[PDB]
Design a protein around this ligand. Structure first.
Ligand SMILES: [Mg+2]
Ligand SMILES: [Mg+2]
Ligand SMILES: [Mg+2]
Ligand SMILES: [Mg+2]
Lengths: 226, 195, 196, 212, 204, 125, 232, 222, 195, 196
């Protein structure tokens, strides 16, 4: 997994690859790692996939209820505080490593959070098995006062570094841009540089190829009238 | 405990269970009956860890007898086996699990069919024409796979069972001191006193 | 990590490096290890980042609630709250915290709370993996009632050496000055302190 | 793995399965577990594939040197003992071998020796080795007679491996049959278990538990 | 010892044109010993199909659990549960046992009764959802299944062509796994007809 | 201390009436009018913002409340009771549904959950 | 079997149109202690080869002596020792690779990761890696330790495949190497600012640069970073 | 503690035709999650119309190939430049491998060529020297993904003739070199999609009576 | 291997040894003779680790036969037992020790006396009226302590031996498939073919 | 243990503490850790006393035999012999040795040989458990071409701090001065160096 977060002029951008693995095997070639905590607060997760999803949704649920209770739009610091206190309590047993980014009435924010409950602030961050490849790119090209277009470019370039160089990362690049005073724009499959080539042969079988012992209709309908 | 076998024939279920009880160095008993009658037409044999086997079996027996009295009705073998499975499935994630494997031989009076269920200590249930637990199946299943027919009489079932026990007595390192054999059919449960 | 707090004539100054490592990888090279638990009571954190952040957050809560009821807490009181958490949960924590603060009655004070949860009031304190290399330097160069500029130089020079020898320390040198005048943040970059 | 060998009126029947596994992974279904040491001697292979292959091929070289030097066919007793003495030298080093050395000579008649990597050497009439050995023994023990015909003996060996191949997860693929006579061994073909199972089920009426 | 490979077995699910398919082997074992050749691993709750591999006691337990939950769902909602909703229920149910999980590999398959859209999904033992467009695999021969499915699969197959593709994926994968086989079943699922076919395969 | 009122405060009178429920309905009767109309392509709910004082900012008092993105609520009767019910209704939509099925509850089932909470305040101690 | 004591971190390298470049910092760490600050880890062999070594420094000093002995030995009874029968990069590598694999096979390894960079007689670029296990491989870019994770991604953006080599000048290659060393200084806790860089060109020969420093560093943005979440 | 072994990934595949043989392998070399090389040849021409690959721990693989190439050289010296037959090379490799029975070459070896009747031949070895002549054999990381596919598409396993419904098997008709290469390419393309250690490039060595020919194909680099 | 018993009566030594050979799960053989004739009037039974038992026994046999030929003379049972003890005492501090326990039953033709020696794998030698190895003594010694008389006939020795085997067959968990019994006296060694 | 060697204008000076511990017990409080392997080639020993004594004895033998054949050895040659023993027997040794010597051609030289058996020629070197606390002090206070009196003060002050913080160091401070003039032994007692 490769995930990055980049601050820019009027907001923040977060990006991720689309490969999910079961050890050395690729379970899903187009996974969605960019998750929504609230409309304008998104995060990307590395580590134990069920933990990163479960924790986003839980804090996302409580954030929504909080927003309704306070008649205010949710803040990134709230998501962060709720995430870290939950994770700390479970002493790293919930293997969620996240990059949290968003905009709120206070401004634009970018944080990272680790499974044991520690958090960090930054203008650019990377996470996952491809984090070193990604950070190499970020450390080479990041500057202060980036534009929206420059940040999207830098973020996707950082993910690409992971895709090509990290075996745990691959396939496509997903992006989400959170700009102040705007709707957050989720760009699913922003880049698609790994389409499989056409196969040399069709493996469609002749009908009747497979040997069959019994056939029967399965009743999926409910008990009928009359 | 050691060897427990089961075979479902045309009109009955036959359970064979070893008689030996060994505590490490010595064989303390050679006439132990590793079975409990759960209801008039349902028998359960068992094998596993010492103490837990009888404790579990008697606990199940008490529960089925309680149901029988409350409803004035005998549960079907299928219903009893499902109840037993759940108890073992519950047990496997407990603080200290029941280490008990069972065979449930019952005659369903409603369907007029014999039924044999094999359940291990994890709560793994399967309905079978013949079954076993432990290493018993390793020696006996090749014989049962060959000779078994669904239309066998009780006498033919007993003869096939004798062949299985003979193979066990030949190739097994442990002396299990023979088997007690019980038959479950429409008339209930009875013990074959010469085997 | 290399952290220290030093009392001087007008108050106290906290100092720290900015490096956070996961093994040999620098996970964060611009970390802020100087954390505010009250207006003029800050702390330097060492050990588990998760633990020290959790502790500091709880202390900040305790002192915010204290202030609402009883007014501004003393630096001793803040150190006591830190100690209570560190001592009672010593089996499940890895935290080495230096507490520094300014009162008008008591002026600059420094308390160090090592691993066990004991408290030690000192004129100055050093902690973190990098502190081992500067016990000799700090002991020889510390004086009581230094000026602000002298104390800044003392911390700058001390953490410079700690960073020089300790691989787990590095980045920028952050400092926080606590006096009657207020709260001043300072930062010193590699090109400055490496040539000292 | 399942292998058997038994002595009878017409010599020796050797029957083996063909499966090789690396954990749950079936690496091969076409493995040769009978080794043609020479035209008169057969060896079965259980345990370490390499240990069995290597040392029983080596055994063939020692048997050949023996008959060159002594101008006489080596006894099964002597051949088996060359192998058992060799593996005994390596005891503790981690060889894994379970084999039946099978032969038919004038002075001995049909002879089988179970040889094993911890130094065991047993002469016997019936042997079964492997993960599926218990299943094969059941069929063997209940049907074995000394006065079996070559045809019936071959089938018994085939049927016994099939029993094991069915029940034992780590046995299967195909059945290889051999018949060992005084004039040498005779190969009796490779029999796919998939096809053999259905054939036997229908013709024999066995495996009623399985739907076909 | 490894709970996910004591009993053995496999499940595979595929999507086609206006159809889905889900298939499984029939083996249940105690490691090397084959115990049952009639242990079906696919269940259904209305028009939603669920295949489960792994520890057999948990497979049985989870079927009973989801039957329980979907029956209450129907009574309250006055409608049958949909594949997308059921997938979330499986995920929720599995994660609630995060630190004492069921050792299973579930697979959901079905067609949304309102949109008509084919749906499949897979999970790890603690609820992480894999919603693939193409195919989902699970079991002790998951590696083999991934290899077969990746090469044999093509999108928008008709029901009768999808049957051959999924059957061959299962069969040949199972024949390279010691703990899978002993029979097989394939479900071909259309919006208002479902056919179930038992396959003839080698019994070793 | 401890809540030592573990007994029902709503009970059947000889005539079969549950007094406290009847009296609660009387409080509702005194409340400001609210209404709801269902159309083919929508539903409307409305009420009067009866401002207690002209110095009060009645926009800060929400009588019509979002429960889920597709469900809204209005009331007549005691405002404070309504406010806490809205809080409970919003939470139960998540805890007993969205965290299980990954989607918001249908109207009838959320109503059922709110109804259950109100029923329990009629029987609990 | 042993454990490394005094260690050297990443060695990075790449090919360009007319030759190869290799670089390595001047630090000898003692665990987390940055003990020795003047350690040369690039060792030239003749005028056509540079061997860059990471890992255990005592083993590096041993290898350095083996190479010095190799040059002495090659000159024995060899009138063409400074011509046709001079040591080639490929000869030097194969020798080291032989030693490394032999040592691992006696369960007594030289705890190193080595990159041999050079130019062959026919002008061909040579760049190959060998480590304590005797594992060998070649690539347009090669790096050890942390360099493998952070430098390779950057260097591979310049030379991504074989066909990119003739398109890459020495100025572009050196620039990329120097940037990678800066990135490693930012992110490797066992790195130093001071490093050595060597260029082996088929036209201009061996250029050995000592006492280089990481410059043009970005740190100013640190002043704005406060707290770890809520702190202002 | 020092671990003398490592895993350099990679996947190889050998298929024996009627009058030819192919030995293919990916060109990617890895440790853990890093790529060492995108092009590091793994299948070698060893002389006498024999091709070889020892997949697994690359240092052991290189040593074994090197020793076998040397064995071919000394076979010529010692036996009047006699051609080393594929069966003789197989037996020779067994002895090289078993010579390190108690400190094994951590590799899965496959060799390909033609037998003494000109027919295609592939031999497969385990790490300690057990070997077998085979028609089809994949080795390495993605072997479990490839072999079931080959059983189905090369040996027509589980395929029956339409209309007979399981009564008549699909007949085993001989495959051309072009047909085999299609299956090899499709095998590696599929493996590259689902296995993280497989990718970058595919190099195939084809062996006929005319000699040894090479073919290279790109694979996905992610 | 498992049970080996020995008893020295008036005019002979009787050795009883089990027939079973078990390799883990299966009983591979039920007619194994766990003994070697070292000389015409000296027999050695053995039990211990697989392979090492027969290897050791045959090695001893070869050495005694070599001595017999060289000197044209049969060594006394005492001399043979001392040679065997030294070999086992040497073995216990070797790189890989022989894990073999033996009984040596011999008739001394010079003294006209039967002699039974018990030696374990450490080289612990004792001359006894009756002996055993492993768990065999735990079941049989109480019977031998009671009934044994130094003036017993061979027939009485065999009867006492039968009682010992019966007790073993009753209380031992393992099925050792009966025993082969051999008698050593002035006329040499012979096997009792019905026991 | 706290040991160091420092080059200066007229040659080199070796310095050491005198404490030898077995756990927390001081087995010897007046140990001589400055050992002579040749007339003007000495060494400071740290690590296993058994190992460093055995090594030094062997080196003294090697240099005595060298001198009989080839004349006075260089300090580099002595360091090489030390290294050869420490490197080739690294699996069975725990030795950290500083080698210091005076030539007339090369003047004062210092070589440090840490645990692994590597060699490092330095202007000055510090080693032993107590050295960790004075990396900062020594780096800030060392100058090249110091006078004899300055170098004595530098070592005295440095080891004073090492002793102050390290429990494994203590006792007296021994020093050996190597110049053209000859070999001078110095000793400094606690009452002297503790008040620095
Ligand atoms: Mg540093
Ligand atoms: Mg099988
Ligand atoms: Mg299978
Ligand atoms: Mg890949």
């Amino acid at each position: 997994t490769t995930i990055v977060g980049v601050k820019f002029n009027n907001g923040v951008v977060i990006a991720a690859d689309t490969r999910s693995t079961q050890g050395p095997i690729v379970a899903d070639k187009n996974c969605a790692k960019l998750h929504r905590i609230s409309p304008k607060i998104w995060c990307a997760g590395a580590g134990t996939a069920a933990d990163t999803e479960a924790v986003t949704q839980l804090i996302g649920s409580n954030i929504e209820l909080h927003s309704l209770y306070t008649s205010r739009e949710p803040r990134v610091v709230s998501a962060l505080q709720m995430l870290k206190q939950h994770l700390f309590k479970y002493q790293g047993h919930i293997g969620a490593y996240l990059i949290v980014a968003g905009v709120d009435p206070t401004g634009s924010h970018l944080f990272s959070i680790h499974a044991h409950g520690s958090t960090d602030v930054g203008y650019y961050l990377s996470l996952g098995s491809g984090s070193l490849a990604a950070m190499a790119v970020l450390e080479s090209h990041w500057k202060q006062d980036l534009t929206k277009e420059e940040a999207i470019k830098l973020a996707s370039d950082a993910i690409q570094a992971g895709i090509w160089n990290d075996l745990g990362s691959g396939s496509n690049v997903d992006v989400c841009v959170m700009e102040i005073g705007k709707d957050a724009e989720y760009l699913r499959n922003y880049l698609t540089p790994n389409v499989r080539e056409e196969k040399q042969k069709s493996y469609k079988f002749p009908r009747g190829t497979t040997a069959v012992l019994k056939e029967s209709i399965v009743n999926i309908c409910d008990i009928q009238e009359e | 405990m050691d060897i427990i076998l089961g075979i479902r024939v045309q009109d009955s279920v036959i359970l064979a269970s070893s008689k030996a009880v060994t505590r490490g160095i010595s064989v303390l008993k050679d006439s132990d009956d590793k079975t409990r009658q759960l209801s008039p037409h349902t028998l359960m044999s068992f094998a596993g860890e010492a103490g837990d086997t009888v404790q579990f079996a008697e606990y199940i027996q008490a529960n089925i007898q309680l149901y029988s009295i409350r409803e004035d009705y005998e549960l079907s073998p299928q219903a009893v086996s499902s109840f037993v499975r759940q108890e073992l499935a519950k047990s496997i994630r407990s603080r200290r699990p029941y280490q008990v494997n069972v065979l449930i031989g019952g005659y369903d009076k409603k369907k007029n069919k014999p039924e044999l269920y094999q359940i291990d200590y994890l709560g793994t249930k399967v309905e079978l024409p013949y079954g076993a637990h432990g290493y018993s199946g390793f020696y006996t299943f090749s014989l049962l796979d060959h000779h078994y027919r669904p239309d066998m009489t009780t006498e033919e079932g007993l003869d096939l069972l004798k062949l299985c026990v003979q193979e066990l007595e030949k190739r097994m390192p442990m002396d299990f001191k023979g088997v007690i054999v019980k038959i479950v059919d429409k008339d209930g449960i009875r013990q074959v006193d010469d085997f | 990590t290399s952290i220290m707090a030093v009392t001087f004539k007008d108050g106290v100054i906290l100092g720290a490096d900015s490096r956070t490592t996961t093994g040999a990888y620098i996970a964060n090279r611009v970390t802020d290890k100087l954390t505010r638990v009250h207006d003029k009571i800050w702390c330097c954190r060492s050990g588990s980042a998760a633990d020290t952040q959790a502790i500091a957050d709880i202390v900040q809560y305790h002192l915010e609630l204290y202030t609402s009821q009883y007014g501004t807490p003393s630096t001793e009181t803040a150190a006591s709250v830190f100690k209570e958490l560190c001592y009672e949960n010593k089996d499940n924590l890895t935290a080495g915290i230096i507490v520094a603060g300014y009162d008008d009655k008591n002026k600059g004070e420094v308390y160090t709370i090592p691993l066990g949860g004991s408290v030690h009031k000192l004129p100055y304190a050093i902690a973190g993996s990098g502190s081992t290399f500067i016990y000799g330097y700090c002991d020889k160069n510390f004086r009581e009632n230094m000026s602000k500029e002298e104390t800044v130089d003392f911390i700058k020079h001390s953490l410079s050496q700690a960073i020089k020898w300790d691989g787990s320390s590095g980045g920028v040198i952050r400092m926080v000055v606590l006096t009657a005048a207020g709260v001043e943040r300072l930062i010193f970059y590699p090109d400055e302190y490496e040539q000292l | 793995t399942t292998m058997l060998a038994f002595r009878f009126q017409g010599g020796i029947i050797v029957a083996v399965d063909s499966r090789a596994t690396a954990g749950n992974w079936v690496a091969s279904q076409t493995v040769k577990k009978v080794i043609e040491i020479n035209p008169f001697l057969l060896g079965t292979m259980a345990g370490g594939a390499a240990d069995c292959q290597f040392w029983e091929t080596w055994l063939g070289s020692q048997c050949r040197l023996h008959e060159l030097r002594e101008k006489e066919r080596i006894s099964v007793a002597a051949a088996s003992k060359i192998l058992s003495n060799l593996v005994y030298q390596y005891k503790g080093a981690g060889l894994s071998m379970g084999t039946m050395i099978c032969g038919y000579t004038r002075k001995e008649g049909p002879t089988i020796y179970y040889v094993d990597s911890d130094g065991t050497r047993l002469k016997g009439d019936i042997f079964c080795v492997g993960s599926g050995q218990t299943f094969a023994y059941g069929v063997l023990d209940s049907n074995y007679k000394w006065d079996l015909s070559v045809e019936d003996a071959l089938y018994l060996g085939k049927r016994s491996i099939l029993a094991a191949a069915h029940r034992d997860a780590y046995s299967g693929g195909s059945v290889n049959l051999y018949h060992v006579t005084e004039d040498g061994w005779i190969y009796h073909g490779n029999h796919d278990v998939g096809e053999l199972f259905w054939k036997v089920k229908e013709e024999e009426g066995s495996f009623n538990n399985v739907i076909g | 010892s490894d709970p996910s490979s004591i009993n053995g077995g496999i499940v595979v699910a595929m999507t086609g044109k206006d159809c889905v398919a889900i298939a499984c082997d029939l083996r249940l074992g105690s490691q090397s010993l084959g115990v049952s050749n009639k242990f079906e691993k696919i269940f259904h709750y209305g028009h939603v199909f669920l295949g489960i591999t792994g520890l057999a006691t948990d497979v049985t337990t989870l079927n009973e659990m989801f039957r329980y939950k979907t029956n209450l769902y129907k009574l309250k909602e006055e409608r049958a549960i949909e594949p997308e909703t059921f997938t979330q229920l499986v995920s929720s149910s599995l994660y609630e046992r995060r630190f004492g999980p069921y050792f299973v590999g579930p697979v959901v398959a079905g067609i949304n009764s309102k949109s008509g859209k084919p749906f499949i999904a897979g999970f790890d033992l603690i609820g992480c959802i894999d919603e693939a467009k193409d195919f989902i695999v699970s079991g002790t021969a998951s590696d083999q299944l991934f290899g077969m499915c990746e090469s044999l699969y093509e999108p928008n197959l008709e029901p009768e062509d999808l049957f051959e593709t999924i059957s061959q994926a299962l069969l040949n994968a199972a024949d390279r796994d010691a703990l899978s086989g002993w029979g097989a079943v394939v479900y071909i699922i259309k919006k208002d007809e479902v056919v179930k076919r038992y396959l003839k395969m080698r019994q070793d | 201390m401890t809540d030592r009122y573990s007994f029902s405060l709503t009970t059947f009178s000889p005539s079969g009436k549950l007094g406290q429920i009847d009296y609660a309905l009387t409080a509702v009767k005194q409340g400001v009018t609210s209404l709801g109309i269902k159309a083919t392509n929508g539903v409307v709910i409305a009420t009067e913002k009866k401002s207690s004082s002209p110095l009060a900012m009645s926009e800060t008092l929400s009588k019509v409340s979002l429960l889920t993105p597709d469900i809204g609520a209005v009331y007549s009767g005691m405002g404070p009771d309504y406010r806490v019910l809205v809080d409970k209704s919003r939470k139960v939509a998540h805890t007993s549904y969205k965290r299980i099925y990954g989607e918001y509850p249908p109207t009838k089932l959320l109503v059922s959950e709110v109804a259950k909470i109100m029923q329990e305040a009629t029987q609990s101690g | 079997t042993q454990q490394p004591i005094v260690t050297g971190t990443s060695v990075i390298s790449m090919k360009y149109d007319n030759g190869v470049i290799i670089a390595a910092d001047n630090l000898g760490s003692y665990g987390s202690l940055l003990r020795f600050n003047g350690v040369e880890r690039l060792i030239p062999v003749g005028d056509n080869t540079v061997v860059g070594i990471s890992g255990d420094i005592s083993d590096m000093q041993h290898i350095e002596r083996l190479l010095k002995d190799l040059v002495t030995e090659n000159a024995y009874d060899n009138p063409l020792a400074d011509a046709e029968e001079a040591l080639e990069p490929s000869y030097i590598f194969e020798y080291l690779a032989t030693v490394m694999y032999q040592r691992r096979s006696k369960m007594n390894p030289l705890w190193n990761a080595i990159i041999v960079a050079g130019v062959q007689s026919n002008g061909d670029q040579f760049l190959r890696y060998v480590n304590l296990l005797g594992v060998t491989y070649s690539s347009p870019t090669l790096a050890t330790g942390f360099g493998a994770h952070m430098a390779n991604p950057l260097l591979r953006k310049v030379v991504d495949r074989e066909s990119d080599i003739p398109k890459t000048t020495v100025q572009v290659a050196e620039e990329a190497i120097v940037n990678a060393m800066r990135v490693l200084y930012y992110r490797d806790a066992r790195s130093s600012r001071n490093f050595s860089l060597a260029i082996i060109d088929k036209n201009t020969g061996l250029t050995f640069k000592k006492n280089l420093q990481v410059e043009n560093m970005k740190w100013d943005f640190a002043k704005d970073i406060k707290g770890y979440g809520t702190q202002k | 503690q020092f671990n003398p072994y490592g895993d350099n990934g990679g996947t190889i595949l050998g298929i024996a035709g009627e009058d030819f043989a192919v030995l293919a392998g990916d060109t990617r070399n890895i440790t853990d999650y890093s790529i060492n090389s995108r092009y590091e040849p793994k299948v070698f021409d060893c002389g006498d119309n024999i091709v070889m690959s020892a997949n697994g721990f690359a240092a052991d693989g290189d040593a074994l190939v090197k020793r076998f190439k040397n064995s071919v050289k000394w076979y010529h010296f010692d036996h009047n430049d006699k051609k080393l037959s594929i069966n003789s090379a197989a037996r020779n490799i067994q002895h090289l491998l078993y010579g390190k029975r108690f400190f094994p070459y951590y590799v899965h070896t496959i060799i390909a060529g033609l037998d003494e009747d000109g027919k295609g031949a592939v031999y497969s070895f385990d790490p300690v020297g057990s070997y077998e002549r085979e028609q089809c054999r994949a080795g390495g990381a993605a072997a479990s993904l490839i072999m079931p596919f080959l059983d189905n598409q090369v040996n027509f396993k589980n395929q029956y003739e339409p209309g007979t419904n399981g009564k008549v098997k699909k007949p085993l008709k001989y495959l051309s070199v072009e047909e085999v290469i299609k299956l090899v390419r499709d095998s590696f393309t599929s493996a590259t999609e689902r296995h993280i250690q497989v990718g970058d490039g595919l190099e195939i060595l084809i062996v006929t009576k005319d000699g040894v020919r090479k073919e290279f194909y790109e694979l996905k680099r992610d």
